[PDB]
Amino acid sequence: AIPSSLSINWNNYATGAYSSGNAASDFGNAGGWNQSRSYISDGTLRVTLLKNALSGAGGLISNIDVSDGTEYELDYDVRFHSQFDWSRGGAVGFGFSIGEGNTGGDPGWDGNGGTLRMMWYQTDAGRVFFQPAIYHKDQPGQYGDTFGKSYPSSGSITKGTTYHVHVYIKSNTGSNRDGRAQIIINGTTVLDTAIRWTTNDAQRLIKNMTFHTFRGGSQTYWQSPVDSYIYYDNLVLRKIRLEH
Ligand SMILES: O=C(O)[C@H]1O[C@@H](O[C@H]2[C@H](O)[C@H](O)[C@H](O[C@H]3[C@H](O)[C@H](O)[C@H](O[C@H]4[C@H](O)[C@H](O)[C@H](O)O[C@@H]4C(=O)O)O[C@@H]3C(=O)O)O[C@@H]2C(=O)O)[C@@H](O)[C@@H](O)[C@@H]1O
Numbered sequence: 001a002i003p004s005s006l007s008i009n010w011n012n013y014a015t016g017a018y019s020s021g022n023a024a025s026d027f028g029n030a031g032g033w034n035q036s037r038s039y040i041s042d043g044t045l046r047v048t049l050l051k052n053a054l055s056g057a058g059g060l061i062s063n064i065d066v067s068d069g070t071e072y073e074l075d076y077d078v079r080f081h082s083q084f085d086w087s088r089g090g091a092v093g094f095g096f097s098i099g100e101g102n103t104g105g106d107p108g109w110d111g112n113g114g115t116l117r118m119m120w121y122q123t124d125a126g127r128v129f130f131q132p133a134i135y136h137k138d139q140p141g142q143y144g145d146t147f148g149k150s151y152p153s154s155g156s157i158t159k160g161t162t163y164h165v166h167v168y169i170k171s172n173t174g175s176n177r178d179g180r181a182q183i184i185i186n187g188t189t190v191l192d193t194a195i196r197w198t199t200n201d202a203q204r205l206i207k208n209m210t211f212h213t214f215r216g217g218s219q220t221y222w223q224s225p226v227d228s229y230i231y232y233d234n235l236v237l238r239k240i241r242l243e244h
C-alpha cells in the first residue's frame, strides 16, 4: 500500500518486539526499518537511540512512501523518556519529503527537492528545544534551515512530557514562494512560513513521510553513553490535495 492517509495507535500489540513486517502492515510500507530498535511499550511505539552512535548507525531512519500530493498534514504524540539524556540533540518525529527529498548535508539549492522535519537541540548554556530542520531551494546552509525558530521560544522542553505535533506542508509552483511549511506543538505555532520547496515542477510533489529518530549532528559530542528511548503514539496522516 502506498497510502494517502493513515491512523496508527499501536493499541493492538502486546508489549514487546515490533518488526519491520509490523511496520509495513501499519504504515502500508516503511523502508529502511531497523527492528532491533523498535518496540511496543504499553500501546506506544518506542524507538531506541543506541549509545556511542549517531544517525542511522544508532537510530531509526524510515521513509514511508505516500500517494503523491501537493498538500499534506500529519499529527502525532512524542514523549522523551523521563530520564532521557538530551545531549546535543538530534532528529525526532514524522515529517515530509518533496521531490528528491534532500536531507543530510545535501541542500536543495538545485530546486529539485526538500524535506520538512523536526529536531531537538541543546545550546551551550543548556536550553533544550524543538526546532525546524527544513531543506528547501533557499536554505542558507548545507544542512537544514531552522528559520531561527524554537519551541518553546523561551525556556526548555521537558523529559517525560507528551508533545502533540501537527505538521502541514504545501507544494509551491514554479519559482514562486507559494508553498507552505507549518509546525504546531501543543497548539503553539512554531513555524508557519511561505516557502519555495522547489523550482523544477517535475519534483514539486510531496512523495513520502519521514520517520527519522537519531542523535546528531556528526560530531562525537552529540552522542550519549546510554541507550535512550523516545515514545511515539497516535500517528494520523491525511492527504489534503493534489493540484497538478
Ligand atoms: O551545534 C553544533 O554543535 C554543530 O552543528 C553542526 O551542524 C549539524 C546540524 O546542526 C544538524 O544537526 C545536522 O544533522 C545532520 C547530520 O549531521 C547527518 O547528516 C544526519 O544524517 C542522516 C540523514 O538525515 C539522512 O536522512 C540519512 O538517511 O542518514 C544520514 C547519515 O547517516 O548521516 O542528518 C542531519 C540532517 O539531515 O541535517 O548535522 C550538522 C553537522 O555538522 O553534522 C555545525 O553547524 C557545527 O558547526 C556546530 O558546531
Ligand SMILES: [Ca+2]
Pocket (backbone or CB within 6 Å): 009, 010, 011, 042, 043, 044, 233, 234
Ligand atoms: Ca497507543
